[PDB]
Design a protein around this ligand. Sequence first.
Ligand SMILES: [Zn+2]
Ligand SMILES: [Zn+2]
Ligand SMILES: [Zn+2]
Lengths: 115, 44, 262, 66
Amino acid sequence: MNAPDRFELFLLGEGESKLKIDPDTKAPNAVVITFEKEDHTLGNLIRAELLNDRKVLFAAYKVEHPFFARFKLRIQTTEGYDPKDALKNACNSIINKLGALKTNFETEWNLQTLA
Amino acid sequence: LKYICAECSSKLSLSRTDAVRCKDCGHRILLKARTKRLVQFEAR
Amino acid sequence: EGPQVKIREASKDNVDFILSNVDLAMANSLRRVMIAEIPTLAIDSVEVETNTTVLADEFIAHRLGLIPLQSMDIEQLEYSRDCFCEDHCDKCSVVLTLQAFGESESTTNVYSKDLVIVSNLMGRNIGHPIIQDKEGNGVLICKLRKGQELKLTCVAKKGIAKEHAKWGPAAAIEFEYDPWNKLKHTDYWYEQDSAKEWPQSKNCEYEDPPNEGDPFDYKAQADTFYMNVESVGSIPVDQVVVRGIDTLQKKVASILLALTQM
Amino acid sequence: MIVPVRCFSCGKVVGDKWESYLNLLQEDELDEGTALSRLGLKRYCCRRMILTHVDLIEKFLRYNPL
Ligand SMILES: [Zn+2]
Ligand SMILES: [Zn+2]
Ligand SMILES: [Zn+2]
């Protein structure tokens, strides 16, 4: 009997990490990352904003199979600049932009509530 | 309370031959008294 | 500061607004978070003490499971999951009870406004089933006549919309950008005219018409989105928008700290 | 059967609206399309369920069990 349910759909790695940090062997300074318990709702955002950054050279994510809530992501960039530093810069950009969005939303919501 | 038999709520409490044709009814088919034991469900 | 926001109109149950100076993945991910990831409260497990009605037991379970519940104070308690307790302490769950009787000669309905909170509510605004109409009745559950009985013990838990549609607040969403197709992200199937054979967007007049003859503005990029959020009513709509932005950033910050800890 | 809870497509609660939609057609003599409009279901994925749901529950209910 051993067919998985939806508990494993989003609960983070039980006896396991959140992510793998594995170096590619086909191009200089490339690293693949395996997130799990995530999907497009993450991955597209990270890829798009990381591509918006200029110092990177390649950024693309894929999900393997919709039966599994894991997905990969490949980053290479020019020398000196670490890909992990690129990723953490990207995350900082994301947190700061949508925190601003949140603020802005409560301001306008309170304004629209008349008086 | 062990058997039903009918539209009547005749709780026959049957051991043997206490007018299975229940007194208020006429029936002789003797339906069998859904349990008091506590049951579990799962509203997924 | 950054991503400006403009409110077109608002109500008790739906928000319609404008979002600018943002990128496409940003908006779309907000949409998906807001449709799938909001934590809430819903009834989850049910014990039939006694059923008699025509209506079947797992109908009673399933149709119970879909009644929306008051979830302003949802953040105060924690998952049954993560809870230090076992078997639904007050500090992870809430308990619901239903009573019915075939009293009248007529058929008697059982509305959602009959189930009552039993356990410690500990002063946090949780669990009262929403009554949307102006006639007191909640949503209909079951009907009875003169002899049927229901005795229900119910337990609600945290849950999120990803693993079941019970735990959704979302209920609908809308989304639109470039109503005039200036970005050329589509072209229209037609047989005489694209312009004649398609209805104009309602959001057309918010931007100018494409000025008819100017060349293809290739360097441009999508912005200025058009959202309409419409919650079911288990939680106010401003709360669902703000909580969705909050939980998305919580997710991203979590991945950041995991990376730094690695 | 009862009206469903919760339109399968969209998710908006339906089931409060049922007996209201009935008495919109009993005494108010109203056309039903306008009845759903005045009931306030402007998308049509929600609209199909009230317009097509049949009520077998009372036809069940006219037995005499126990
Ligand atoms: Zn009998
Ligand atoms: Zn607990
Ligand atoms: Zn719908």
